[PDB]
């Protein structure tokens, strides 16, 4: 099946080179847009990089820009992330993350099962205003998010995805465009809004539920994530 | 038998008596009061400028947006036809197609041609490629025409005089449809799913009640091989092309003909015949290397299509009826409005 | 003003058009031949040495070749004989020995008028193939040519014989002047069936250029 | 007398009565045949040859060039009327000159090229140089521009303008005896291309009449019109060279002193010069007028 | 044999045993469907270009 493995962690002394390798397996790589999204030990999710299908397009974090290199080599179906001048600001959990564009398309379906890397001592603000909610088995809660710009297009969708990170797991689409229902989702799940305020409804909740739920805009790079909402109970 | 031939011919002959003592009216008469459409001024909103041979099929998606078209280039290619953009470009196995097929799940297309089979792609795979996902292989003629009842079934018109329905689950043909002593060229299908109509080159028409294999109405009329069929949106009537250079309208409550559409200065056959959303209009493809659409109630031609530099093979129109998708035998598709 | 989907899906689509680009400058490099005749002549003969439609790949000369041979196709040829409007050339084959009886060599003539004198095939050349020369040879020593032939008066020679039969499938061509009829006596004895069919091929394509060229 | 030193070079610049005489009328019938031509020619390609392949590239090049060099044709008429009195300031000058220049070099050029595709499409056959998509030609057609332009720009950079007598000169092809680059670009313009499309003529010639292809009609037609193509280049180009080469060698033997030798070479160069504009004039009759297809 | 003399029969007296209606009925049922669903026809009443998919 679809399959995304990293590798390339381990303790990196400031100012290292440390070079990030991801394997995939399973799905058509060379035509899939690959982005790397890390995420800090107890922070929420992080956009670094992005490579589109052909490298024709490459794109970078604020963060990282001039730091780190992503580079993608179909023949072998590897990606790769070159970290130079590590810092301590940069000890976090990076992803792999598949992406394909077209129309009706689901991009972020995939997620890859994370790499743990430990360094030794105008951009859309997107909002949740919640930390944690209690919730029971058997009830419906509602999350919202917030954006600054709005993320409605003259188009006539608006980009915004949801993600779920259960515990001791790697993030999985469920709403793509904040309105579409993303494959091996159930149907409990519902995206709504409008611009610069939307909503998550997850009626009858149940186990498998719990965890932390983030909000992402791809109206235009960078990509940014919410804080996170926690779900517990 | 001498018995049987003559009580063939006796039927035949009650056949055309009751059909001669329902016609009390032609539509023309009926339809004269009508005020005339006037003048159908059509632009080239669009232009698909990806194919690089003979287009022979095109079909539209159950959304006015994506549209999938067939090239002896051996090429299927799905059309973003709002931003000209190729979602997909499908290589096929045998670049001898001439008929193609939109799912209206939007989850499958189908491929079809000389080498009579007709080939299921997939769309929407966890791959994230296009991949075969059934071959149908029980045909003996070219495939001509092929259109989905839904993800699981699609019926098809082959070469062979007859008509197939699948099923796509086992790949074996549920149903066999066989009253054509001639090629079939052209297939349509009822807003229902229910029925279908398909038109061969002994040039007459059947009505095909498509849950068990029957005959249930025979049109005639066309004086040559019928090349395209199309349902009228209300579902009660069809259009047929034949390459006479006249289009025809046949009502099945009725079972006769209703209204010819012929013209003099036209002497080409038609390729292609489509409704709008409303029925007022029929557009039908030419040898001309241009459209003519037609007032279908009045009988008189309302406007041309002339963008095209070949025999325009196939023709489509959107769901909501918001544009027209024209292609023909040079590599272009051109959407009008 | 694209939004990044929107530039990523337009970058999607001009990769799918450069693929759609060198998919097409590789097939225009291609040398499509439509392979007909009669369902008992050397078809399989020609096509030895190299349900539906059955296509055959060979390369000659570092020239790809690709033979259409649409036999198995009951159906009326009207409906798909436009198909392959645009082919190189057509490679027709004639049993000599087909003469006997059951006629076959009127069938011939009557699909090779069909086929030559065809409003797809105006300006397409014809490679004429004539097979079985020996027992054709076998054949005429003992038999006479007169039951094909009512209105032939000629020595039952070979070579008299072979000449009158090429002229009797050559004078059929209605196209003499846009069209050219190559016709060779298909032998065994070594590969030079594919000669002569590359030859052939190579003046087509040397017409064609000049067509293009505006100067032919 | 003369030695008016052009620039400092000391050339032996003439005025002549034949000039006005012979050279005014020529030139009018070439501006009105060449330019009906060009014009006729341009208008089918821009409308009737949406076809666009790259020997109709290369083609609408070649007539592109010389109706350019038809509109620029009439400046130079009207100082023929005179003994060459420049009556259009400085800057139609340098224009004029520097766009003939690069107008002959540019036909030159493209019928070159068509030589060349032609014989890419007759002795090879299967070559990928026979199937260029319409970019690769047009990137090659804006190459060829660029080494004309390259190579003629050393005409617009000079206040050509001077003094003859009392009244003005627009002439570039004076009898200086320091060559330049532009002497040797104009012995080169029909030197090497003289080769390629003789070259290219007869083995073109000789394919198609050895591989028995002189039998269809339009195959004898295209070897005449091979033929002819290269005779009117021949017939054209070769006077005005002929004369070059005779008043270099005058140079080299009379050792740039006296003018009046000089007198009736420099009087003869500018009438057989009236033939490089004929080229143009009577290359779309023959180019694309003449061709089978309409 | 004569199986497809048979199934001919078959086919022709089946087709025979069908309801049939008047075609000035037929005629004004589909002038009827058309005059209804004219308002929604954007091609034959051309829509602004504020509202139509194909503007540009
Ligand atoms: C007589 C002359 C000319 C040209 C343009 C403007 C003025 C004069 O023709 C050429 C030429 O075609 O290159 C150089 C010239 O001396």
């Not at chain 1, 305020?197 to 909000?215: H, K, N, Q």
Request: aromatic share 12%.
């Amino acid at each position: 099946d679809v399959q995304l493995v990293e590798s390339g962690g381990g303790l990196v002394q400031p100012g290292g080179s440390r070079k990030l390798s991801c394997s995939a397996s399973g799905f058509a790589f060379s035509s899939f847009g690959m982005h790397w999204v890390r995420q800090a030990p107890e922070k929420g999710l992080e956009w670094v990089a992005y490579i589109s299908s052909g490298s024709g397009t490459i794109y970078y974090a604020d963060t990282v820009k001039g730091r780190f290199t992503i580079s993608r080599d179909d023949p072998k179906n590897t990606l790769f992330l070159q970290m130079t001048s590590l810092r301590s600001e940069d000890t976090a959990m990076y992803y792999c993350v598949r992406s394909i564009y077209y129309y009706g398309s689901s991009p972020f379906d995939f997620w890859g099962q994370g790499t743990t890397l430990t360094v030794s001592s105008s951009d859309i603000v997107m909002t949740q205003a919640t930390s944690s909610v209690p919730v029971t088995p058997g009830e419906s809660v509602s999350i919202s998010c917030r954006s600054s710009k709005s993320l409605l297009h003259s188009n006539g969708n608006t980009y915004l995805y949801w993600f779920l990170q259960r515990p001791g797991q790697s993030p999985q689409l469920l709403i793509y465009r904040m309105s579409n229902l993303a494959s091996g989702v159930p149907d409990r799940f519902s995206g709504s809004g409008s611009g610069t305020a939307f909503t998550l409804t997850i009626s009858r909740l149940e186990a498998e539920d719990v965890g932390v739920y983030y909000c992402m805009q791809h109206l235009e790079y960078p990509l940014t994530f919410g804080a996170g909402t926690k779900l517990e109970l | 038998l001498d018995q049987l031939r003559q009580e063939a011919e006796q039927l035949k002959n009650q056949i055309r008596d009751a059909r001669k003592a329902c016609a009390d009216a032609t539509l023309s008469q009926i339809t004269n009061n009508i005020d005339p459409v006037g003048r159908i001024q059509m632009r080239t909103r669009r232009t698909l400028r990806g194919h690089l041979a003979k287009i022979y099929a095109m079909h539209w998606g159950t959304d006015s947006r994506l549209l999938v078209s067939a090239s002896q280039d051996g090429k299927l290619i799905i059309w973003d036809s709002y931003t000209t953009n190729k979602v997909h470009a499908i290589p096929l196995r045998s670049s001898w197609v001439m008929t193609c097929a939109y799912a209206p799940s939007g989850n499958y297309v189908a491929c079809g041609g000389l080498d009579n089979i007709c080939s299921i792609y997939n769309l929407k795979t966890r791959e994230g490629n296009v991949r075969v996902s059934r071959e149908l292989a029980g045909h003996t003629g070219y495939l001509s025409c092929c259109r989905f009842l839904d993800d699981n079934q699609i019926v098809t018109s082959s070469g062979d005089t007859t008509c197939a329905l699948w099923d796509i689950e086992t790949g074996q043909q549920t149903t066999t449809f066989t009253g054509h002593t001639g090629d079939v060229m052209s297939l349509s299908l009822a807003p229902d799913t229910r029925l279908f109509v398909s038109g061969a080159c002994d040039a007459s028409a059947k009505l095909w009640d498509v849950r068990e294999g029957m005959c249930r109405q025979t049109f005639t009329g066309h004086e040559s091989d019928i090349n395209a069929i199309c349902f009228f949106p209300n579902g009660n009537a069809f259009a047929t092309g034949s390459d006479d250079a006249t289009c025809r309208l046949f009502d099945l409550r009725a079972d006769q003909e209703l209204m010819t559409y012929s013209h003099d200065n036209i002497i080409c056959g038609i390729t292609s015949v489509s409704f709008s959303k409303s029925g007022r209009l029929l557009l039908a493809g030419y040898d001309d290397f241009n459209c003519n659409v037609w007032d279908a109630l009045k009988a008189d031609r309302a406007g041309v299509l002339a963008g095209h530099d070949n025999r325009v093979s196939c023709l489509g129109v959107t769901d909501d009826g918001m544009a027209v998708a024209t292609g023909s035998w040079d590599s272009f598709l051109k959407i009008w409005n | 003003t694209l939004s990044a989907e929107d530039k990523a899906a337009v970058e999607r689509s001009k990769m799918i058009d450069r693929n759609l680009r060198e998919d097409g400058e590789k097939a225009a490099r291609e040398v499509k031949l439509l392979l007909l005749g009669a369902g008992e002549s050397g078809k399989s003969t020609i096509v030895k040495q190299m349900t539906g439609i059955v296509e055959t790949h060979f390369t000659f000369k570092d020239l790809h070749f690709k033979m259409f041979d649409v036999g198995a196709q009951r159906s009326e040829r009207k409906k798909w004989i436009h198909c392959f409007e645009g082919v190189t050339a057509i490679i027709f084959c004639v049993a000599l020995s087909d003469y006997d009886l059951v006629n076959r060599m009127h069938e011939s003539m009557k699909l090779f008028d069909s086929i030559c004198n065809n409003k797809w095939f105006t300006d397409t050349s014809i490679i004429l193939f004539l097979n079985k020369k020996d027992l054709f040879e076998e054949k005429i020593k003992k038999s006479p040519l007169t039951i094909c032939y009512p209105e032939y008066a000629g020595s039952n020679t070979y070579e008299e014989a072979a000449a009158y039969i090429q002229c009797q499938f050559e004078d059929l061509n209605k196209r003499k002047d846009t069209k050219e009829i190559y016709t060779h006596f298909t032998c065994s004895t070594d590969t030079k069936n594919v000669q002569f069919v590359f030859d052939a091929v190579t003046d087509v394509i040397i017409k064609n250029n000049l067509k293009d060229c505006g100067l032919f | 007398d003369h030695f008016l030193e052009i620039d400092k070079k000391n050339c032996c610049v003439f005025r002549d009565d034949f000039i006005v005489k012979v050279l005014p009328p020529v030139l009018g019938l070439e501006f009105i045949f060449g330019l009906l031509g060009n014009g006729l020619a341009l208008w089918i390609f821009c409308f009737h040859l949406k076809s666009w392949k790259s020997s109709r590239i290369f083609l609408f090049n070649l007539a592109v060039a010389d109706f350019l060099l038809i509109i620029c044709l009439p400046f130079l008429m009207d100082n023929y009327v005179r003994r060459w009195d420049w009556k259009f300031g400085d800057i139609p000058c340098r224009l004029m000159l520097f766009m003939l220049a690069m107008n002959r070099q540019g036909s030159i050029i493209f019928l070159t090229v068509v030589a060349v595709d032609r014989y890419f499409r007759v002795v090879h056959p299967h070559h990928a140089l026979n199937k260029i998509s319409n970019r690769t030609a047009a990137i090659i057609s804006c190459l060829l521009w660029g080494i004309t332009i390259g190579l003629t720009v050393h005409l617009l950079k000079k206040k050509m303008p001077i003094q003859n007598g009392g009244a003005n000169l627009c002439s570039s092809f004076s009898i200086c005896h320091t060559f330049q680059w532009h002497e040797a670009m104009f012995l080169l313009e029909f030197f090497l291309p003289l080769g390629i499309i003789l070259f290219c003529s007869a083995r073109i010639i000789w394919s198609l009449r050895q591989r028995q292809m002189d039998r269809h009609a339009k195959i004898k037609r295209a070897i005449t019109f091979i033929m002819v193509v290269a005779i009117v280049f021949v017939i054209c180009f070769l006077p005005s060279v002929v004369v070059r080469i005779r008043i270099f060698w005058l140079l080299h033997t009379s050792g740039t002193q006296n003018c009046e030798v000089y007198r009736s070479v420099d009087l003869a160069f500018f009438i057989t010069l009236s033939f490089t504009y004929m080229n143009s004039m009577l290359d779309p009759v023959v180019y694309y007028f003449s061709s089978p297809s309409f | 044999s004569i199986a497809q003399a048979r199934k001919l029969v078959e086919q022709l007296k089946m087709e025979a045993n069908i309801d049939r209606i008047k075609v000035s009925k037929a005629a004004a049922d589909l002038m009827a469907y058309c005059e209804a669903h004219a308002k929604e026809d954007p091609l034959l009443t051309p829509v602004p270009a504020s509202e139509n998919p194909f503007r540009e």
